[PDB]
């Protein structure tokens, strides 16, 4: 007769498929490998759609495939990893010199600006030239993360390691310290961080402090987990008594990330992620305002029309749980959570009015944190 | 920073990013009202009492327009988009620059549609929109 | 294409193919109103909310006529046809050429019949018609 | 330590560790009732009497939710886990911070499942859970 | 993937492969209810307890229709097929696209037939169908 | 063949060959209801199920009349014929021409007789008739 | 009305200033030697442009 | 095609920018630091004559 | 592609900002210290705009 494939198409594969669950961001994987068919000087960066469709980068190379392996391995999955061509030369023609690495970093923006979290993986680890990345991601709307495979961060005294020579001075970088042969930045970042939607109520994952990756292994120790992550028991986190990083400890029968991805003494990853969502959302709403209107005039009515955007974004953010609840944290008395002040074009001279650059609008904040540590006393009287 | 007397020349209203322009005549052209009472006093048979406060922070706004105004066209397109089955937020916001009194709402919806009367003279077109969350702004200039 | 000021000389209404002619005096001679509210906001005991949109797109129109108008004769013949048992649609349509505001409905029905008052001066005759589907036209001239 | 007036903003309910969020409208959104009467008076044919007290300390709670609430998803997953054959406790707890009135139960179970009604407006989803041991907390703030 | 507010324009119901179209007015037009209680708590004379869970996963659904709807014709043909002696399954399925809430059943049967009332205005026609296996779908969009 | 809107002017009911004429006011003037449920679902202690369908195809119809109607005289003569001992069928049939919905029964019997109330205003007279075989007609015009 | 000409206020200080002026000349002291030309004298008009916005700034201080 | 169908006889019909406008169908160019050599536009200062050459290139920023 | 900083400029700092609220007067701070770049015999007094922009006088001098 005829097959049923004449009117339908029903197949069957043996693989694992999870729901998509779009989220916020994308990460960057920079290395020196080039694939010659998709990055060969034509694409300093290249996008994708899924891991399975990877053919250009060999499914055995340690850099790209073994890192996208842990990038795409969360229970809900991110999409479109930003694949690498960036610093294809080895660090620098003079290896010890970081100027070539800095120029390489400064020449990979000029092709693409869609990445938010910067990860080096499976190579470039523990290089002295990496100081350029730490100095450069400062004053740059991104997040820099470096996962070592081995170092001496377990001495609460040494000063030569990554997390020692830069500790307490940088507020936008973090270290994923671990043992050998595991890609870690990709394990949680951009795989759990990415699929975080702040457009819903109560979607503030303020911690990122007890979260399970797809599949991985733990490190070992108890007094070595405080040299790393610099976390003291009940006091908090001390800069002199340790080096901040993330190690994925296990306590009960569960394994989970620990320290919540600090950057400096008491700065956590979700604060940066959420505030960057706020900024990127105000950008999108501003652009959507410039495309609907015929014009935005250079008057006071135009200033109020422009300032209408942060007012909506702040109400959106206070609902998610990022902005505080209108009460003084010290005494519990009433205090406004956020204010928005609009400037006047009136006394800004016409000498400056012809610029077509509007004056600055100023907004005020208050952050709402969360809990990392609990105490219970239990007096007994018989 | 002199306290400006009232004037409709200094009130600005923004609906889905665009300004609201052709308004009818009268002292009530944009009015916002809270959805419910703030609270309730309960007095017992003995003279004791108990107050209860609601968690509902919602409001409606009524906009009165002329039959020839671009905002009427914008609202009638939004109405047809809702009738098709596309249901999204469309923020509304308005404020007074003289006192900083007003409020914002990030997600509104059409609730009532006007009546098309032709007759001998031109007449009002009244729209109603509703939100589930309305936060008034504090008048910091009194 | 200058925006014409309003005038009843430039409004046209078509009932079952024929024009509507002898209208009463006033600012409300043909008025169309939607059947229901567009939607409803539901706020819970905790402060969360939910909007719901209706699928009902129906309207009535009220036509006020003089006791001497051919449209009164046409409508009283349609009423008797309905009373006999013959039930069909009879489209109604009206629009304004100055702004392209109006609407159409392909199947209407008589809903209310007027009162025949004689008295000392002549008075209104008000008819009401209803449809299950009314689509407003977009005013493309604002 | 002023006695706060009542408000649903200061009542917290925890089901299996997570908060209860999208509640329906009304004065009865979470209600707990004891399983039986506390005791029974027995009067004889002569006028003498005897009281008897029960040892059963059990209760049910009814939770009314909106069709769009994460607690509805949590409860429908718990229902399917029970239908599969996995039978465990899942504590429930709720309290009022103004008076310290409430109660706790360390092991609950699904007893009734709601009805899925679609219709024209959105409607309630009512869940029922039951425990064998419910201990009320003493309101120490009166 | 914005959470769409509720609307009957986005609910789809499929009966034996065809859509369900002419529904009556009200908030309860398709309602599904489980056949029995999920479980039972048994408390003894000493205070100990035991829970028991049922293995019955069955439900009924009630569909309210207008006297002029093709689904009424489809259901009255199915009723006559059953009365003749032909007894087969006919799946029923319905879901909401805004939240992915609903359920399916691969074999239904007619249980109650409506009453044919003529009267002065048109009235409801209520059908009831029953299955031995009903599996709710998990609302993954909350 | 336009689908006629509903109207009692286009419903015809025939009792023993003659028309039914003087009906009371209301939306329920002739109503037919099936005698029993169509079927029954039986669920066992293990979760398996079994449906059972009945072979009973019977119905009653209730007719509400005014105290001045020839059908009241016809029915009161039929009642006296039954009381004398003469027991025959007397068919009843009614249908709607707009949709072809209705049914027929070739042998009916009087089941309930009305109450004769005099009072200050005139009131209903309700008759009930029963058949052992009722076959609904298929609405082929939907 | 279209929005091309400014709104009657000094852009520097916000004080009142006319947006446009129109000055009409006199034919009176233009000689008849030039009057026979049938070419009218020139009328002078004054302007002020109303621009619009190309770029926006928002500051967002955070206090925790 | 967009400039032509601009009617200044209506109120508030001043498209003072012509600065964010979508054509019917076309394609974008590429780059970030090459879009400032062309169009000579610096970020917040304005537009500088020495640091670029003015032109129009139809960039894309979001999905627009 | 291109950044959003092509058409807007949105920043974020960690500081405290209060509304301006202009008022009546100004005060004078007289001492013997000189900063040599802004008072060096050229300005017996010098005005400012805000505290943060202070660089001429050391952020530690009493």
Description:
Chain A is an alpha/beta fold and 382 residues long. Chain A has eight helices and eight strands, in the order E-E-H-E-H-E-H-E-H-E-H-H-H-E-H-E. Chain A has helices at 65-71, 99-106, 131-137, 162-165, 185-188, 269-292, 300-320, 350-353; strands at residues 27-30, 45-47, 82-84, 117-120, 143-146, 173-175, 340-341, 357-363. In chain A, helix 6 runs antiparallel to helix 7. The termini of chain A are far apart. Chain B has 142 residues and is mainly beta. Helices cover 11% and strands 39% of the residues of chain B. Chain B contains one helix and twelve strands. Chain B has a five-stranded antiparallel β-sheet with strand order 2-1-7-8-12, with no helix packed on it. In chain B, strands 3-6-11-9 form a four-stranded antiparallel β-sheet, covered by helices on one side. Chain B has a two-stranded antiparallel ribbon with strand order 4-5. The termini of chain B are close together. At the B-C interface, helix 1, strand 9 and strand 10 of B face strand 3, strand 4, strand 5 and strand 8 of C.
Annotate the secondary structure layout:
The structure is cut from a larger assembly and holds 4 copies of chain A and 5 copies of chain B (142 residues).
Chain A: E1 27-30, E2 45-47, H1 65-71, E3 82-84, H2 99-106, E4 117-120, H3 131-137, E5 143-146, H4 162-165, E6 173-175, H5 185-188, H6 269-292, H7 300-320, E7 340-341, H8 350-353, E8 357-363
Parallel strand pairs in A: 1-4, 4-5, 5-6
Antiparallel strand pairs in A: 2-3, 7-8
Chain B: E1 11-15, E2 18-19, E3 30-34, E4 39-43, E5 49-53, E6 59-65, H1 70-84, E7 92-96, E8 101-105, E9 108-112, E10 116-117, E11 125-131, E12 135-137
Antiparallel strand pairs in B: 1-2, 1-7, 3-6, 4-5, 6-11, 7-8, 8-12, 9-11
PDB class: viral protein
Keywords: Sheath-tube, virus, viral protein
Entry title: Cyanophage Pam3 Sheath-tube
